[PDB]
């Protein structure tokens, strides 16, 4: 005789925590579908479940395999992060539910405040003002006294290191933009934020460290639109672009990655990843993004 051996898991979104039990034969898709059911999200094609493997490596959970058969780490509750893996080409057209908008807003704002996306200072200040309007609501001089933003994490650190102003000057500029949003609904605010963030050059780009045959260190970008190559010191502006419509075939063998063009007159592009794992992640992101790109154009 015997009994089932359930398995506790914890799944966090950007603003929520879920805890429940699964079975030794529970698939990732079954876990994913229960996550999005409980929070009421239908725009699921953007998202995945992040976990940490036995060796501390961050990993996207494969939905066509069992949750317990992917070397997820030992914790009585298994720990998953529900996050966006793909980003829309246009937030105003593609993010319909308020849950989806809020989750993208929270995730993108986290990336910006973590200095992942280069931001010009006046853009950063306008971004913060929308985040303030979404959090505080309408500015009121009798409620929001001077210093009301003093404990808010408002700007990316690297904006503060380059453009030199005092803490109170930054907040006064942010407060001044907060005032002009007197009409804005919280949900409308997060969308204005997203509409601004999505035009930043580094927004939505997955960056990987690579080299070419001669050994020059480059950056490889994967985004909703295709691939890009950057020089080592400039992650903003691609040096070579690889839009989907120009790519005929991408492939890798161990560390060697090859991009082949539709126009046979153009030369194949070849670069080298440090690990096989890197090339696998690049290909999963290429295939996912290209798939969503195609579906939008049907």
């Amino acid at each position: 005789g015997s009994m089932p051996k359930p398995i506790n898991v914890r799944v966090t979104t950007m603003d929520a925590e879920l805890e429940f039990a699964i079975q030794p034969n529970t698939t990732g898709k079954q876990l994913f579908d229960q996550v999005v059911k409980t929070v009421g999200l239908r725009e699921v094609w953007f998202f995945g479940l992040q976990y940490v493997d036995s060796k501390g490596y961050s990993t996207w959970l494969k939905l066509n395999k069992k949750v317990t058969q992917q070397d997820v780490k030992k914790e009585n509750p298994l720990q998953f992060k529900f996050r966006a893996k793909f980003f829309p080409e246009d937030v105003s057209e593609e993010l319909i539910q308020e849950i989806t908008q809020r989750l993208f807003f929270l995730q993108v704002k986290e990336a910006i405040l973590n200095d992942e996306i280069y931001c010009p200072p006046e853009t950063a200040v306008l971004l913060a003002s929308y985040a303030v309007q979404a959090k505080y609501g309408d500015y009121n001089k009798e409620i929001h006294k001077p210093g009301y933003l003093a404990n808010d994490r408002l700007l990316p650190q690297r904006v503060l290191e380059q453009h030199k102003l005092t803490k109170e000057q930054w907040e006064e500029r942010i407060q001044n933009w907060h005032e002009e949003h007197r009409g804005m609904l919280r949900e409308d605010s997060m969308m204005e934020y997203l509409k601004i963030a999505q035009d930043l050059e580094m927004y939505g780009v997955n960056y990987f460290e690579i080299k070419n045959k001669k050994g020059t260190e480059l950056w490889l970008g994967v985004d909703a639109l295709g691939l890009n190559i950057y020089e080592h010191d400039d992650k903003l502006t691609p040096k070579i672009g690889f839009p989907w419509s120009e790519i005929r075939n991408i492939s890798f063998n161990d560390k060697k990655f090859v991009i082949k063009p539709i126009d046979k007159k153009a030369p194949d592009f070849v670069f080298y990843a440090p690990r096989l794992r890197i090339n696998k992640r690049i290909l999963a992101l290429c295939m996912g993004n290209h798939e969503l790109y195609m579906r939008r154009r049907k």
């Binding site: 075939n249 991408i250 890798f252 161990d254």
Partner: peptide
């Protein structure tokens, strides 16, 4: 190992 996506 090796993989391909043909687009």
């Amino acid at each position: 190992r090796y993989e391909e996506y043909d687009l």
